[PDB]
Amino acid sequence: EVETFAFQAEIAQLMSLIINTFYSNKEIFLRELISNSSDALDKIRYESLTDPSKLDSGKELHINLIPNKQDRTLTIVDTGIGMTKADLINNLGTIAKSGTKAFMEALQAGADISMIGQFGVGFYSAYLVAEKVTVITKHNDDEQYAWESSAGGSFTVRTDTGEPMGRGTKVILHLKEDQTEYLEERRIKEIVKKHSQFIGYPITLFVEKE
Amino acid sequence: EVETFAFQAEIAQLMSLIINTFYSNKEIFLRELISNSSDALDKIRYESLTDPSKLDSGKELHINLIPNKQDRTLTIVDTGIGMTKADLINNLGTIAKSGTKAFMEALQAGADISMIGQFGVGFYSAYLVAEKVTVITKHNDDEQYAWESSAGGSFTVRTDTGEPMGRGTKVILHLKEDQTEYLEERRIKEIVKKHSQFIGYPITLFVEKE
Numbered sequence: 001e002v003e004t005f006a007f008q009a010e011i012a013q014l015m016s017l018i019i020n021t022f023y024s025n026k027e028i029f030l031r032e033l034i035s036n037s038s039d040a041l042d043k044i045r046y047e048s049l050t051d052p053s054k055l056d057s058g059k060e061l062h063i064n065l066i067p068n069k070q071d072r073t074l075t076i077v078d079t080g081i082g083m084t085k086a087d088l089i090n091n092l093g094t095i096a097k098s099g100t101k102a103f104m105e106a107l108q109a110g111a112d113i114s115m116i117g118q119f120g121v122g123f124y125s126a127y128l129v130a131e132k133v134t135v136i137t138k139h140n141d142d143e144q145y146a147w148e149s150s151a152g153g154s155f156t157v158r159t160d161t162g163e164p165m166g167r168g169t170k171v172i173l174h175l176k177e178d179q180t181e182y183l184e185e186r187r188i189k190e191i192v193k194k195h196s197q198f199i200g201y202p203i204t205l206f207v208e209k210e
Numbered sequence: 211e212v213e214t215f216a217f218q219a220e221i222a223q224l225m226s227l228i229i230n231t232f233y234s235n236k237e238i239f240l241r242e243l244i245s246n247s248s249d250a251l252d253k254i255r256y257e258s259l260t261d262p263s264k265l266d267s268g269k270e271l272h273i274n275l276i277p278n279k280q281d282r283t284l285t286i287v288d289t290g291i292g293m294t295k296a297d298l299i300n301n302l303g304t305i306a307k308s309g310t311k312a313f314m315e316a317l318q319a320g321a322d323i324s325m326i327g328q329f330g331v332g333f334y335s336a337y338l339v340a341e342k343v344t345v346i347t348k349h350n351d352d353e354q355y356a357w358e359s360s361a362g363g364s365f366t367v368r369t370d371t372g373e374p375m376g377r378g379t380k381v382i383l384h385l386k387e388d389q390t391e392y393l394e395e396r397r398i399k400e401i402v403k404k405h406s407q408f409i410g411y412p413i414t415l416f417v418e419k420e
Contacts, residue, residue, distance in 0.1 A: 103408075106408035
């Protein structure tokens with residue numbers, strides 16, 4: 001069963017701005033997704049202080065970067081708190097606690113897209129480089145779910161079976177054809193060193209099997 | 211009744227670094243406290259979407275900046291979600307969900323104190339300019355409380371009566387004697403325009419009665 005949902009109007013507008021604005025400094029998407037992973041890891045780390053059974057689904061707190069040139073995907077994996085089904089729908093489909101409104105106003109008043117993370121909407125910078133984004137997630141309190149969107153105003157949610165993750169979130173970026181530089185090891189290493197060198201969790205760049 | 215608590219060791223260490231490191235760019239404290247206020251406003255805004263009774267304690271979502279040259283205080287007031295007693299003790303007294311550890315490591319690897327907000331500990335930048343900080347707070351689910359610390363490894367919490375706020379948080383900075391520039395209207399206006407010009411809530415700078 002696949003459920004289709006409309007983005008909240010302001011989120012669809014934000015996504016359209018990210019997709020259609022001429023803006024060359026696209027590499028910041030990775031910093032924003034790594035920052036989201038770090039936040040999710042902080043949350044499960046904190047919850048596990050008062051309740052160590054929260055780590056029964058996996059004690060390791062880390063971030064993996066998985067390029068695949070055959071599938072033309074870059075995957076950002078973390079073992080953070082994950083998202084329930086309700087979290088997916090609210091946090092990726094609506095303004096929720098984000099500064100979506102302030103960001104869209106700021107862009108008309110001198111801000112630029114690289115500041116997206118200051119407004120709590122860094123996730124959508126994925127659409128600087130991805131034609132489609134799939135989010136696989138598992139929270140201790142829910143089953144594993146797959147969220148997906150190629151923008152255009154809607155997203156889908158379905159259960160995800162056959163490859164259980166334990167706990168956390170996988171952001172699968174199906175890259176645009178002209179954005180394959182972000183599958184190159186040297187380029188990923190450069191961007192991680194530039195923007196994500198102070199993250200408090202290990203970031204492992206996987207090697208391609210080819 | 212006044213309860214005295216020890217900071218978690220890493221928080222005491224962080225505070226000592228902020229107090230003792232030579233670092234002239236102190237003005238960023240205001241951006242960090244305004245950003246915290248904005249986050250707290252986002253939270254009550256979001257909670258009020260599904261439960262409008264959460265705004266029964268005050269519908270206005272705003273940030274006030276109150277300088278007082280006679281008391282040598284700068285107060286940052288917001289009508290955000292506020293903090294319960296437990297929130298005060300956990301969120302100001304311990305690492306909680308913050309990147310305290312990563313920040314202290316980053317400072318030994320090329321980061322500087324102006325990046326404190328990237329690690330979720332921007333509140334403690336108050337000690338760049340304040341000898342003592344008092345936090346008055348009211349959450350819908352608890353009574354009004356006053357947290358206070360002059361650093362030195364401890365903080366106090368007591369109930370706060372006689373001036374009920376309704377809902378939110380007041381950060382009262384008892385400024386160091388050489389930091390009174392931050393009570394000057396021109397200086398506050400300059401710093402707000404420099405670092406907090408894209409905040410999505412009204413920021414009102416109060417005029418002094420003197």
